[PDB]
């Protein structure tokens, strides 16, 4: 089946994750994607922190395949950089190595809403999210699941304040309304809606479409979108009739329920002026009709990023980072 001398040579020369890094009891993240560890090199050549992602399951899954395939080709300051791949022959587990990002938007937002976000940092975060996603979209790569927990922010070191978009492959707060209405395919606008969801959360500290916990139709999530946005008029989204769940939407909902609902009224309650450049960009990202939603390139050209202050390469802008380091699970 396989040459002995070939197998023996490869086994002697194969770098094993357990020999190179110390990560026992260093788990910092957990999910559907797999587990993440805050690891250090066993050989003292570097004192740098590294992230080790152990993928969910045995062998190479579809998510592991898609992540390895894309990350091997994608080179951008705002997309997470794959440093190495470890194929653990003993237990058939796949490990991915990256530089360690001390923060993410999930923890940054969590810290702020617990107190109850600097506006220069919000603008800088968004410009780096749009920059990273524009690169992915230019290479015909879609994120498919953008959420705060995926928008990593580098801590102290040579890349301080740099945003890194992670994960390539329960909560529908960031899922576009066309997905919730049965749109079969993933599109560029689905990623844009998610960025709009994140931008509203960075501006208010609350998930704009927060909803209480296998079909594509989620009544409660659509209801929360209409309580914030209002029910879409025929003129606003003409192809709503073409959605597989349109008859269900007509059966379960009534336009009247959300008559006094609009994004203006929602954002006003969270102290975000409807005449501000931030609001106008947010409304262009959070458009019900996907064909009427702005692109990443058009969003980056918005006069919001020209208004004082300008976005910075370091989102923190040299200021001391108030956010605590990630705790070991």
């Amino acid at each position: 089946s396989m040459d002995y001398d070939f197998k023996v040579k490869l086994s002697s020369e194969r770098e094993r994750v357990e020999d190179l890094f110390e990560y026992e009891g260093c788990k910092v993240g957990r999910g559907t994607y797999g587990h993440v560890y805050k690891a250090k090199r066993k050989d003292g050549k570097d004192d740098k922190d590294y992230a080790l992602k152990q993928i969910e399951g045995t062998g190479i899954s579809m998510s592991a395949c898609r992540e390895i395939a894309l990350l091997r080709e994608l080179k951008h300051p705002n997309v997470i950089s794959l440093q190495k791949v470890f194929l653990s022959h003993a237990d058939r587990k796949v490990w991915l190595l990256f530089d360690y990002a001390e923060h993410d938007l999930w923890h940054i937002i969590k810290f702020h809403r617990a107190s109850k976000l600097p506006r220069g940092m919000v603008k800088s975060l968004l410009y780096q999210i749009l920059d990273g996603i524009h690169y992915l979209h230019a290479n015909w790569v879609l994120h498919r699941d953008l959420k705060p927990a995926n928008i990593l922010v580098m801590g102290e070191g040579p890349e301080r304040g740099r945003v890194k978009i992670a994960d390539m492959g329960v909560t529908f707060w960031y899922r576009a309304p066309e997905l919730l209405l049965g749109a079969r395919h993933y599109t560029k606008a689905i990623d844009i809606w998610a960025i709009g969801c994140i931008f509203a959360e960075l501006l208010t500290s609350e998930p704009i479409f927060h909803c209480r916990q296998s079909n594509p139709y989620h009544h409660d999530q659509l209801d929360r979108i209409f309580n914030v946005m209002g029910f879409p008029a025929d003129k606003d989204w003409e192809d709503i009739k073409k959605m597989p769940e349109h008859s269900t939407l007509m059966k379960d909902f009534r336009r009247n329920t959300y008559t006094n609902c609009s994004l203006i009224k929602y954002m006003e309650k969270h102290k975000v002026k409807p005449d501000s450049k931030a609001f106008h960009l947010l409304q262009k990202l959070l458009t019900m009709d996907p064909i009427k939603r702005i692109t990443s390139e058009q969003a980056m050209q918005d006069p919001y990023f020209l208004e004082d202050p300008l976005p910075t390469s370091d989102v923190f802008a040299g200021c001391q980072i108030p956010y605590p380091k990630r705790e070991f699970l």
Binding site: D3, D5, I60, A69, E73, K75, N139
Partner: protein, 264 residues
């Protein structure tokens, strides 16, 4: 995925020198002649083609699996891993990469067993001996020894862009596409960029169908020396096709091929 080829792992690591390829091949050339080696490569290309047809996979999945196979044996001997195990493993890995899904254990093994039994009985008197544990083991080795380079660029996409630019998508595309499928009988995918293979295939297609494409070809600004190099290989491949009787020769060529050595 549809990024810039000049920044890809395909261009920066898997566009090889014709002499580096020949030097690495010398290990197997002690057992097989230079002629017998390219016949064996055609054979397995056709094996991967029959596998993809059976599994109802698109030409892109079949082509990605072919490039994996060719890439692995460009760096390693035919004895390192059995090519009879490498061929369905490549098909299995490429189906995951190209987003066609995970071929089930029972669907993949049955496809390998049936294809060899019903289409390659002249070369294989015994049934497909491998099981899923063998495919899953080979998969780990294949992914490791390709430096995890999974995204492969093919001539099909730029070819469709060229024919559409010509306004001859109905006349030339069927033949040019067929000529592209045939380049997988050669090492062109390991030596030249895909767009270059697509232009040479379109050139041969224009010659066969007698079409004046000189004006369009002259307004390209591509290195026509390299396009001529590919044309000669395409022309040579059809003369190789005429003189090669796959069905009559493969049993002997497979017996001459070095086999994996077992532990002592």
């Amino acid at each position: 995925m549809a990024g810039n080829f000049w920044q890809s792992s395909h261009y920066l690591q898997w566009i090889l020198d014709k002499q580096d390829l020949l030097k690495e091949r010398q290990k197997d050339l002690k057992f097989l002649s230079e002629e017998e080696y390219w016949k064996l490569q055609i054979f397995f290309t056709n094996v991967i083609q029959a596998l993809g047809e059976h599994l109802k996979l698109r030409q892109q999945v079949i082509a990605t699996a072919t490039v994996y196979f060719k890439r692995f044996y460009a760096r390693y001997s035919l004895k390192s891993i059995d090519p009879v195990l490498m061929a369905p493993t490549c098909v299995f890995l490429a189906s995951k990469v190209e987003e066609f899904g995970v071929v089930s254990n029972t669907r993949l093994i049955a496809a390998a067993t049936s294809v060899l039994k019903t289409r390659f009985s002249y070369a294989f008197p015994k049934e497909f001996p491998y099981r899923m544990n063998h495919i899953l083991e080979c998969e780990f080795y294949l992914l490791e020894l390709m430096d995890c380079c999974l995204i492969v660029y093919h001539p099909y996409r730029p070819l469709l862009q060229y024919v559409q630019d010509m306004g001859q998508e109905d006349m030339l595309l069927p033949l040019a596409w067929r000529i592209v499928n045939d380049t997988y009988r050669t090492d062109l995918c390991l030596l030249y960029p895909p767009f270059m293979i697509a232009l040479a295939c379109l050139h041969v297609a224009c010659v066969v169908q007698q079409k004046d494409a000189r004006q369009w070809f002259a307004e390209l600004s591509v290195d026509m020396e390299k396009i001529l190099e590919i044309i000669r290989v395409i022309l040579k491949l059809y003369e190789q096709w005429k003189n090669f009787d796959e069905r009559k020769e493969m049993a002997t060529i497979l017996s001459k091929m070095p086999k994996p050595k077992p532990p002592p």
